[PDB]
Write an enzyme that holds these catalytic residues in place. Structure first.
Site, PDB file in Angstrom:
ATOM      1  N   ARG A  18      -3.711 -31.405  14.036  1.00 37.13           N
ATOM      2  CA  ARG A  18      -4.176 -32.376  15.032  1.00 37.13           C
ATOM      3  C   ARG A  18      -5.702 -32.433  15.094  1.00 37.13           C
ATOM      4  O   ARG A  18      -6.313 -32.208  16.140  1.00 37.13           O
ATOM      5  CB  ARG A  18      -3.580 -32.078  16.411  1.00 37.13           C
ATOM      6  CG  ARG A  18      -2.155 -32.571  16.598  1.00 37.13           C
ATOM      7  CD  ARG A  18      -2.035 -34.061  16.312  1.00 37.13           C
ATOM      8  NE  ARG A  18      -0.769 -34.614  16.787  1.00 37.13           N
ATOM      9  CZ  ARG A  18       0.398 -34.470  16.165  1.00 37.13           C
ATOM     10  NH1 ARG A  18       0.473 -33.793  15.028  1.00 37.13           N
ATOM     11  NH2 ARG A  18       1.494 -35.010  16.680  1.00 37.13           N
TER      12      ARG A  18
ATOM     13  N   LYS B 250     -13.603 -31.490  11.792  1.00 36.34           N
ATOM     14  CA  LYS B 250     -13.711 -31.121  10.381  1.00 36.34           C
ATOM     15  C   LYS B 250     -15.169 -30.982   9.959  1.00 36.34           C
ATOM     16  O   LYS B 250     -15.552 -29.999   9.303  1.00 36.34           O
ATOM     17  CB  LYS B 250     -13.000 -32.155   9.508  1.00 36.34           C
ATOM     18  CG  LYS B 250     -11.507 -32.277   9.755  1.00 36.34           C
ATOM     19  CD  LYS B 250     -10.862 -33.185   8.721  1.00 36.34           C
ATOM     20  CE  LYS B 250      -9.466 -32.709   8.350  1.00 36.34           C
ATOM     21  NZ  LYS B 250      -8.821 -31.944   9.450  1.00 36.34           N
TER      22      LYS B 250
ATOM     23  N   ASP C  57      -9.714 -37.675   0.845  1.00 34.86           N
ATOM     24  CA  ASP C  57      -9.562 -39.070   0.451  1.00 34.86           C
ATOM     25  C   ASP C  57      -9.152 -39.917   1.648  1.00 34.86           C
ATOM     26  O   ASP C  57      -8.547 -39.409   2.596  1.00 34.86           O
ATOM     27  CB  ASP C  57      -8.562 -39.206  -0.714  1.00 34.86           C
ATOM     28  CG  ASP C  57      -7.150 -38.740  -0.361  1.00 34.86           C
ATOM     29  OD1 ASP C  57      -6.904 -38.260   0.763  1.00 34.86           O
ATOM     30  OD2 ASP C  57      -6.267 -38.858  -1.237  1.00 34.86           O
TER      31      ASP C  57
ATOM     32  N   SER D 129      -5.382 -46.515  14.327  1.00 34.10           N
ATOM     33  CA  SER D 129      -5.483 -45.083  14.081  1.00 34.10           C
ATOM     34  C   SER D 129      -5.518 -44.264  15.363  1.00 34.10           C
ATOM     35  O   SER D 129      -5.431 -43.033  15.293  1.00 34.10           O
ATOM     36  CB  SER D 129      -6.728 -44.782  13.244  1.00 34.10           C
ATOM     37  OG  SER D 129      -7.909 -45.042  13.982  1.00 34.10           O
TER      38      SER D 129
ATOM     39  N   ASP E 184      -7.186 -32.036   2.436  1.00 37.19           N
ATOM     40  CA  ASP E 184      -6.057 -32.727   3.037  1.00 37.19           C
ATOM     41  C   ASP E 184      -4.885 -32.743   2.054  1.00 37.19           C
ATOM     42  O   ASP E 184      -5.054 -32.588   0.844  1.00 37.19           O
ATOM     43  CB  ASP E 184      -6.466 -34.151   3.428  1.00 37.19           C
ATOM     44  CG  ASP E 184      -5.412 -34.873   4.256  1.00 37.19           C
ATOM     45  OD1 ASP E 184      -4.340 -34.290   4.519  1.00 37.19           O
ATOM     46  OD2 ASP E 184      -5.658 -36.035   4.641  1.00 37.19           O
TER      47      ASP E 184
ATOM     48  N   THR F 151       8.439 -37.800  10.755  1.00 34.34           N
ATOM     49  CA  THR F 151       9.354 -38.705  11.432  1.00 34.34           C
ATOM     50  C   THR F 151       8.587 -39.606  12.384  1.00 34.34           C
ATOM     51  O   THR F 151       7.637 -39.167  13.039  1.00 34.34           O
ATOM     52  CB  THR F 151      10.419 -37.930  12.223  1.00 34.34           C
ATOM     53  OG1 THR F 151       9.775 -37.045  13.148  1.00 34.34           O
ATOM     54  CG2 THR F 151      11.304 -37.112  11.292  1.00 34.34           C
TER      55      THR F 151
ATOM     56  N   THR G  87      -5.533 -30.584   8.592  1.00 35.95           N
ATOM     57  CA  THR G  87      -4.986 -31.935   8.593  1.00 35.95           C
ATOM     58  C   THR G  87      -4.374 -32.181   9.965  1.00 35.95           C
ATOM     59  O   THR G  87      -3.829 -31.270  10.590  1.00 35.95           O
ATOM     60  CB  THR G  87      -3.955 -32.120   7.467  1.00 35.95           C
ATOM     61  OG1 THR G  87      -4.576 -31.880   6.197  1.00 35.95           O
ATOM     62  CG2 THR G  87      -3.365 -33.526   7.463  1.00 35.95           C
TER      63      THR G  87
ATOM     64  N   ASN H 266      -9.703 -41.336   6.778  1.00 37.72           N
ATOM     65  CA  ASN H 266      -9.400 -40.343   7.801  1.00 37.72           C
ATOM     66  C   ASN H 266     -10.189 -39.056   7.602  1.00 37.72           C
ATOM     67  O   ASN H 266     -10.078 -38.134   8.414  1.00 37.72           O
ATOM     68  CB  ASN H 266      -7.901 -40.044   7.809  1.00 37.72           C
ATOM     69  CG  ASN H 266      -7.417 -39.459   6.497  1.00 37.72           C
ATOM     70  OD1 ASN H 266      -7.943 -39.778   5.431  1.00 37.72           O
ATOM     71  ND2 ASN H 266      -6.407 -38.600   6.568  1.00 37.72           N
TER      72      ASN H 266
ATOM     73  N   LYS I  10       7.447 -49.584  17.168  1.00 34.64           N
ATOM     74  CA  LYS I  10       7.499 -48.573  16.124  1.00 34.64           C
ATOM     75  C   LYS I  10       6.327 -47.628  16.327  1.00 34.64           C
ATOM     76  O   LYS I  10       5.241 -48.069  16.722  1.00 34.64           O
ATOM     77  CB  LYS I  10       7.441 -49.254  14.752  1.00 34.64           C
ATOM     78  CG  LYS I  10       7.472 -48.378  13.511  1.00 34.64           C
ATOM     79  CD  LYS I  10       8.779 -47.675  13.314  1.00 34.64           C
ATOM     80  CE  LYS I  10       8.797 -46.959  11.978  1.00 34.64           C
ATOM     81  NZ  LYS I  10       7.819 -45.853  11.923  1.00 34.64           N
TER      82      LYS I  10
HETATM   83  N1  LIG Z   1       0.024 -47.056  10.697  1.00 35.96           N
HETATM   84  C1  LIG Z   1       0.198 -45.976  11.497  1.00 35.96           C
HETATM   85  N2  LIG Z   1      -0.012 -46.052  12.829  1.00 35.96           N
HETATM   86  C2  LIG Z   1       0.157 -44.986  13.634  1.00 35.96           C
HETATM   87  N3  LIG Z   1       0.542 -43.773  13.197  1.00 35.96           N
HETATM   88  C3  LIG Z   1       0.787 -43.555  11.883  1.00 35.96           C
HETATM   89  C4  LIG Z   1       0.625 -44.671  10.939  1.00 35.96           C
HETATM   90  N4  LIG Z   1       0.927 -44.189   9.719  1.00 35.96           N
HETATM   91  C5  LIG Z   1       1.254 -42.879   9.868  1.00 35.96           C
HETATM   92  N5  LIG Z   1       1.171 -42.501  11.157  1.00 35.96           N
HETATM   93  C6  LIG Z   1       1.457 -41.143  11.683  1.00 35.96           C
HETATM   94  O1  LIG Z   1       0.390 -40.721  12.537  1.00 35.96           O
HETATM   95  C7  LIG Z   1      -0.216 -39.511  12.074  1.00 35.96           C
HETATM   96  C8  LIG Z   1      -1.707 -39.732  11.859  1.00 35.96           C
HETATM   97  O2  LIG Z   1      -1.910 -40.942  11.132  1.00 35.96           O
HETATM   98  P1  LIG Z   1      -3.399 -41.449  10.791  1.00 35.96           P
HETATM   99  O3  LIG Z   1      -3.620 -42.769  11.490  1.00 35.96           O
HETATM  100  O4  LIG Z   1      -4.354 -40.303  11.025  1.00 35.96           O
HETATM  101  O5  LIG Z   1      -3.322 -41.726   9.206  1.00 35.96           O
HETATM  102  P2  LIG Z   1      -3.035 -40.519   8.179  1.00 35.96           P
HETATM  103  O6  LIG Z   1      -3.831 -40.719   6.947  1.00 35.96           O
HETATM  104  O7  LIG Z   1      -3.450 -39.122   8.864  1.00 35.96           O
HETATM  105  C9  LIG Z   1      -1.273 -40.487   7.761  1.00 35.96           C
HETATM  106  P3  LIG Z   1      -0.782 -38.796   7.336  1.00 35.96           P
HETATM  107  O8  LIG Z   1      -1.229 -37.869   8.401  1.00 35.96           O
HETATM  108  O9  LIG Z   1       0.821 -38.720   7.199  1.00 35.96           O
HETATM  109  O10 LIG Z   1      -1.460 -38.374   5.938  1.00 35.96           O
HETATM  110  C10 LIG Z   1       0.475 -39.107  10.780  1.00 35.96           C
HETATM  111  O11 LIG Z   1       1.010 -37.783  10.911  1.00 35.96           O
HETATM  112  C11 LIG Z   1       1.551 -40.156  10.529  1.00 35.96           C
HETATM  113  O12 LIG Z   1       2.871 -39.597  10.479  1.00 35.96           O
HETATM  114 MG   LIG Z   2      -9.771 -39.827   4.429  1.00 44.24          MG
END
Ligand SMILES: Nc1ncnc2c1ncn2[C@@H]1O[C@H](COP(=O)(O)OP(=O)(O)CP(=O)(O)O)[C@@H](O)[C@H]1O
Ligand SMILES: [Mg+2]
Length: 929
Positions: A644, A650, A670, A466, A345, A518, A580, A673, A488
């Protein structure tokens, strides 16, 4: 589902509920020993020397000393339980001393242990003591009912968690009843209900419960009610036994062990047939001669490998170049040397997790890091329509986040569970609107700028999920008293929910190929009546019709020295993928900026119901039915990019790769996720310095961010593999040499092959005379750790297995045949083989053989360390002084003849000259640098 009443003490105190006693192995531990051994009994080499041990159980096959019999099996058992039995008995120890921890009872008014603790009774648990079991908070020392809890041992969370009590029950003390659900496995979920007098229901969740390994503070004590009993605690289900890990090296050792078994069995048949098939009992003869042939190699190899694991872990965890590394599974610390695939990742692992907002765009108006004057004067003018939208957007940024402050002298610091909003608040305070202290449990919002102090309060909040990809709030003002609903999150879910607006899609695409991640913001004006009828209480009613405010673009600075790491990787020939759940455009942008793709290397994309990108759904469909052709395509492609992906695919990628090619891959990640892609990986490496820590502690290795693994793979795994290969080569080498010595003795004297070597001689040769050079070679290397960066190409010399194969086994066998044969035949020829001077022949044979070993170990030396050159001299002098007094029963005689030394020197020179010349010519042939 159960109903808990504290006043009904006997109905739970007597029975029907599990006691808090935890038992691990008593009256079944004996039944535990074979089945665990069964996995070791699955490996055929353990089978091999275990049957070698079992053979002498018949009271006719005792051929040597019992001191040659007990010590190898006993010592291998000692080593193999040294790591695990200490941990098991320590586990039993702090299990017993925790189950007798005294705890005060509200009803009984005295201290009772954990065994006497039952379910439903009220316990005041203090600040300086851990939570004993799984409970639910009903009253705390704080009048608000909120407290900070610590579960550093329960789960991987290290920060201090909010836990509130029931407002109805916090004021209480009258008796109060609970209703709970069935035992589960989820570590971040809870549901329950509280019933009071006249049946007044009160809700419960994970926010109002304390589990088995929780630690209390932020109070003096608190009143809590037990819920789950003994085995019903989640720790008894969420913790599972670690699966066994198999390395390729030990598998090929097992294979060559079967090969050597067949070889020595054939040799035993050959000797027995050449004897003349006499003594009328062929089977006891072949078995005893097989055991005589099989008493040096199989047991020494195991202990040498185990000491190799120990010293290798010591070397990994004792490097100044590698600070703060942790090995968590020492079973296979070896496969890192032969790895072809990297699954990783970018979150933290390939980045520094440092965030900076760069571009924010509202109403065809774009602001950047520059031009902060306009937004600053807008903030100052807070206390035409585009300015109103800008200040409202700043307000939404400053409120909707869930960031916690902390005060100091200047530059007040912020921490949260998602640091993108930390970047947001950093940007907002840099503009000039400075947010201040946040309760985050009660209702308070403080925001001061160059003007006058502003105060709000949140009417209601929904935490981020999540899967929801959203977080929403509603806020009431005090200065002007309006109801602001704010939302948000990601546009992918709320685009149809907000409006029929047009200017979201193409701008999200624009900042997508700007390499900016974004998210998007919406607002809505609400009223009091709708708010209170909402507060009467599903998710559908929360979002009705929003209005778009704007969107922001935040960038991240990539990890320190990514480009050097990646160029060392593909100059090492190792293959790297990228899986990722991010968006496709930001993925290709970050891979370009990380120089993951060189010049050319056309990129292709996949979307369905060189370089290649594939979405998660299409990845699953190609891993669904069209499995094998997809696997065939992806192996030859230098880089693979996926988007996605939820962790199940994975884990499936890892499983299908390891099952369709049988090679060893590295999967580093790490956070929560990517928990699955370590537990299903050949090796798992932890990342430190980022908020997520459960995966790192649940991993097998640990590096700072990315750098150490590089030097861990080039300079450490390769050296580990080379020294293990030399260890195996040398152990089968001298075993085959001595075996051929007994074989040639039997050819030259048809009495018995036993008559040559018995007693303490073979014991000492197996144990005392040879292990020190092996462990000296265990430390020897060729290339400095500073020079491993310049020459990674040597990796392409280990991917094929040219050092461990059938032909390698045959080469070592033939070399051993050559040297053992020349020593034995020349000794017998020059010494006039008889039965009187038999001591002289056996003495010169043992002496020549051991000194030949102690010299050839010096031939295969690359660097002369000051700690290595003494080891062989110690064994040499130990041999010299062990003759006249230590052994002094076998092979006794003079042996100090002038011609004895000349003959010994010439025969050793003859035996060691061709291999030394071959190594010299090979060094002249393949010069490394
Ligand atoms: N607290 C939150 N709630 C919802 N979506 C979030 C979030 N923080 C980040 N995201 C966005 O949703 C996508 C997936 O977030 P996820 O919940 O899987 O944590 P993450 O560890 O993958 C953040 P990232 O993908 O940027 O490393 C990410 O691409 C990110 O831009
Ligand atoms: Mg992880």
């Amino acid at each position: 589902e159960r109903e808990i009443h504290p006043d009904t003490t006997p109905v739970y105190d007597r029975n029907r509920y599990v006691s808090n006693e935890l038992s691990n192995a008593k009256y079944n531990a004996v039944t535990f020993v074979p089945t665990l051994l069964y996995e070791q009994f699955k490996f055929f080499y353990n089978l091999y020397f275990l049957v070698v041990a079992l053979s002498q159980a018949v009271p006719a096959l005792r051929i040597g000393y019992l001191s040659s019999y007990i010590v190898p099996l006993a010592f291998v058992l000692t080593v193999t339980m040294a790591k695990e039995a200490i941990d098991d008995i320590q586990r039993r120890r702090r299990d017993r001393e925790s189950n007798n921890e005294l705890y005060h009872v509200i009803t009984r008014n005295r201290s009772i242990p954990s065994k006497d603790l039952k379910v439903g009774d009220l316990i005041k648990v203090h600040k300086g003591d851990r939570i004993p079991a799984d409970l639910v908070l009903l009253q705390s020392s704080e009048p608000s009912g909120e407290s900070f809890i610590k579960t550093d041992q329960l789960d991987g969370e290290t920060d201090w968690k909010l836990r509130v009590a029931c407002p109805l029950t916090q004021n209480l003390i009258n008796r109060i009843s609970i209703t709970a659900s069935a035992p589960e496995k989820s570590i971040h979920k809870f549901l329950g209900k509280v019933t009071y007098k006249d049946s007044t229901s009160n809700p419960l969740s994970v926010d109002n419960t304390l589990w088995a390994n929780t630690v209390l503070a932020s109070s003096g004590f608190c009143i809590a009610c037990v819920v789950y009993t003994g085995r019903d605690t989640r720790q008894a289900m969420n913790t599972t036994t670690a699966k066994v890990k198999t390395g390729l090296l030990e598998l090929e050792i097992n294979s060559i062990s079967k090969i050597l078994c067949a070889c020595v069995f054939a040799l035993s048949i050959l000797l027995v047939a050449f004897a003349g098939f006499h003594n009328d009992d062929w089977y006891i003869d072949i078995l005893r001669y097989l055991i005589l042939f099989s008493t040096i190699i199989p047991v020494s190899l195991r202990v040498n490998l185990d000491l190799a694991k120990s010293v290798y872990a010591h070397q990994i965890e004792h490097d100044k170049t590698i600070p703060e590394t942790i090995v968590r599974t020492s079973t296979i610390p070896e496969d890192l040397g032969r790895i072809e695939y990297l699954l990783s990742d970018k979150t933290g692992t390939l980045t520094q997790n440092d965030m900076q907002l760069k571009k924010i765009h509202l109403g065809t108006v774009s602001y950047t890091s520059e031009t902060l004057d306009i937004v600053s004067d807008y903030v100052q003018s807070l206390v035409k329509d585009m300015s109103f939208r800008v200040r409202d957007m700043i307000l939404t940024l400053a409120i909707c986040h869930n960031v916690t402050p902390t005060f100091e002298d200047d530059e007040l610091t912020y921490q949260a569970a998602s640091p993108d909003e930390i970047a947001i608040v950093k940007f907002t305070e840099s503009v000039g609107l400075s947010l201040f202290k946040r309760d985050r449990h009660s209702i308070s919002l403080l925001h001061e700028h160059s003007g006058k102090t502003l105060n709000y309060e949140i009417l209601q909040v929904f935490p981020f999920n999540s899967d929801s990809k959203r977080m929403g709030i509603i806020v009431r003002d005090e200065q002007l008293d309006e109801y602001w609903f704010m939302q948000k999150g990601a546009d992918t879910v709320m685009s149809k929910i907000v409006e029929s607006n047009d200017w979201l899609e193409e701008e999200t695409g624009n900042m997508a190929r700007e390499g900016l991640r974004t998210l998007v913001i919406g607002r809505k004006k609400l009223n009091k009546k709708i708010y209170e009828q909402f507060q009467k209480e599903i998710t559908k009613y929360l979002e009705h019709d929003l209005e778009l405010l704007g969107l922001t673009g935040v960038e991240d600075k990539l990890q320190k020295d990514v480009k050097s790491s990646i160029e060392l990787l593909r100059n090492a020939g190792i293959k790297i993928w990228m899986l990722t759940g991010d968006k496709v455009e930001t993925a290709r942008c970050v891979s370009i900026s990380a120089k993951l793709i060189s010049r050319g290397q056309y990129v292709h994309t996949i979307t369905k119901v060189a370089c290649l990108l594939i979405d998660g759904e299409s990845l699953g469909m190609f891993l669904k039915h069209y499995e094998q052709e997809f696997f065939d395509v992806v192996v030859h492609l230098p880089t693979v990019i996926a988007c996605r992906c939820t962790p199940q695919q994975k884990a499936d990628v890892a499983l299908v790769i390891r099952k369709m090619t049988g090679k060893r891959v590295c999967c580093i990640g790490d956070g929560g996720n990517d928990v699955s892609m370590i537990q299903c990986a050949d090796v798992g490496v932890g990342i430190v310095g980022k908020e997520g820590k459960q995966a790192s502690l649940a991993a097998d290795f640990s590096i700072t961010q990315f750098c150490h693994l590089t030097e861990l793979l080039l300079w450490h795994g390769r050296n580990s593999y080379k020294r293990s290969a030399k260890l195996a080569q040398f152990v089968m080498h001298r075993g085959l040499i001595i075996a051929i010595c007994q074989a040639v003795y039997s050819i030259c004297s048809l009495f018995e092959p036993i008559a040559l070597y018995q007693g303490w001689l073979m014991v000492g040769y197996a144990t005392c005379y040879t292990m020190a050079p092996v462990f000296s070679l265990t430390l020897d290397h060729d290339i400095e750790e500073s020079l491993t960066k310049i020459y990674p190409e040597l990796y392409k010399e280990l991917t094929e297995g040219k050092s461990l194969s059938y032909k390698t086994f045959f080469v070592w066998v033939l070399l051993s045949l050559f040297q053992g044969s020349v020593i034995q035949l020349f000794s017998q020829a020059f010494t006039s083989l008889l039965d009187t001077d038999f001591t002289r022949m056996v003495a010169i044979s043992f002496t020549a053989l051991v000194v030949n070993e102690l010299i050839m170990v010096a031939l295969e030396i690359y660097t002369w360390n000051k700690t290595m050159l003494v080891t062989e001299i110690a064994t040499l002098l130990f041999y010299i002084v062990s003759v006249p007094f230590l052994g002094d029963y076998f092979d006794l005689g003079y042996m100090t003849t002038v011609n004895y030394y000349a003959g010994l020197l010439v025969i050793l020179l003859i035996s060691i000259f061709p291999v030394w010349t071959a190594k010299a010519i090979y060094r002249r042939l393949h010069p490394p640098s």
